[PDB]
């Protein structure tokens, strides 16, 4: 798929994603915070359609992600991100997608997610997170 | 004067400042790097005119500031930044302004300037720098 | 179990742990780097005996922490860390323990593990890792 790298910002205001209950996560885009003002990150789109859109609008700055979890699994022979769940100090968003495959979880005791990078083809192939104090 | 705060970025591409060879630093503006792209910082301006503009264009990312030095002194009863010098790993830019009063110097052995904050009235009253790895 | 917290150091030189092929991880001790010298961390011991010891001696500083993975599961009514694997830029150390239950994985693209904290009763109940550039 097409690799993407948003880089680092000062926080997360919103996560916009898409999923399909039969396959995996599709589209992924983030509205970051950049020194107290929103910064609309590039929309990272799937090569295909048929996804259910989801908007995770955070109460920035008092609400912040404390855990990112999900599942990785095979879809049409490709290893992709099948599900995502975002846990904040205020709410749980998800799971979105299929809760099937290999679970992963990134809980944070200290620090913040300040950026995302990854790759998207038909589905979100992989992702990584920038962490900062 | 009026306080300003650019916040934090990923590096520095250009510094646009103004000075008067008899008073102090006037205007101050930074073109930052934001995850591989130019980010034009706000132009922080003096409430008066008559300054000489200076463009410090850096060869980003190979060129970066290793030392910021200057002088603070009394101009018309106000303690202001009278002069500034920027030494990179490639060249020395400055001194711009008046080499009079109390010197200061910020040499950096490890890390980078990633932002500026301060205050400007008729002149640059004060400034601080954001440092990051 | 008994909570422990080694705090932050400058790197890892050696990891000493124990496991039982029928249960989970028992003992946990780290020889950290502290500004170029070895710093022997406190030995965090299980409340019981009968474990197999393992010494992971790293070629510090060229060898370092690129992934930590393992399994959590139920052992005698308790949710504990059943297995651990430490993967470096040179070699894979493990799996140690029982690879049963729910997997977890912490791959690192940039930064280092510089400390450990958690809790140990009969087994390693849970753990967290300090990360730094």
């Amino acid at each position: 798929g097409k690799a993407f790298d948003d880089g680092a910002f000062t926080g997360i205001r919103e996560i916009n994603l898409s999923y399909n209950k039969e396959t995996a996560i599709g589209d992924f885009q983030v509205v970051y915070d950049l020194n107290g003002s929103p910064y609309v990150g590039e929309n990272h789109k799937s090569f295909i359609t048929g996804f259910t859109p989801v908007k995770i609008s955070l109460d920035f700055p008092s609400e912040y992600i404390m855990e990112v979890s999900g599942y990785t699994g095979k879809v049409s022979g490709y290893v992709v991100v099948r599900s995502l769940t975002f846990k904040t100090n205020k709410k749980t968003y998800g799971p979105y997608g299929v809760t099937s495959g290999t679970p992963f979880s990134l809980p944070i005791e200290n620090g913040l997610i300040v950026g995302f990078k990854g790759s998207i083809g038909y589905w979100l192939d992989y992702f990584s997170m920038y962490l900062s104090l | 004067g009026k306080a300003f705060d650019d916040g934090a970025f990923t590096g520095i591409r250009e510094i646009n400042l103004s000075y008067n060879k008899e008073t102090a630093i006037g205007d101050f503006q930074v073109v930052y790097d934001l995850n591989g792209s130019p980010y034009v910082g706000e132009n922080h301006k003096s409430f008066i005119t008559g300054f000489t503009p200076v463009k410090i264009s850096l060869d980003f990312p190979s060129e970066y500031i290793m030392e910021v030095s200057g002088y603070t002194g009394k101009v018309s009863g106000y303690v202001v930044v009278r002069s500034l010098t920027f030494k990179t790993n490639k060249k020395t830019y400055g001194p711009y302004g008046v080499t009079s009063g109390t010197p200061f110097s910020l040499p950096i052995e490890n890390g980078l300037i990633v932002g500026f904050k301060g205050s400007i009235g008729y002149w640059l009253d004060y400034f601080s720098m954001y440092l990051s790895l | 179990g008994k909570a422990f917290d080694d705090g932050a150091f400058t790197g890892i030189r050696e990891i000493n742990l124990s496991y039982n092929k029928e249960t989970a991880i028992g003992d946990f001790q780290v020889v950290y780097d502290l500004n170029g010298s070895p710093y022997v961390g406190e030995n965090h011991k299980s409340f019981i005996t009968g474990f197999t010891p393992v010494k992971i001696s790293l070629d510090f500083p060229s060898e370092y922490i690129m992934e930590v993975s393992g399994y959590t599961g139920k052992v005698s009514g308790y949710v504990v860390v059943r297995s651990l694997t430490f993967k470096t830029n040179k070699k894979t150390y493990g799996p140690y323990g029982v690879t049963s239950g729910t997997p977890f994985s912490l791959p690192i693209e940039n930064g280092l593990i510089v400390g450990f904290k958690g809790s140990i009763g009969y087994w390693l109940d849970y753990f967290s890792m300090y990360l730094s550039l």
């Binding site: 290893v79 192939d125 992989y126 990584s128 | 970025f9 990923t10 | 791959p107 930064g111 990360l131």
Partner: peptide, 16 residues
């Protein structure tokens, strides 16, 4: 090494 700020990066989770 260069004038580019660095950050701790965790991952990737998924392919590769």
């Amino acid at each position: 090494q260069s004038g580019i700020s660095q950050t701790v990066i965790v991952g990737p989770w998924g392919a590769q």
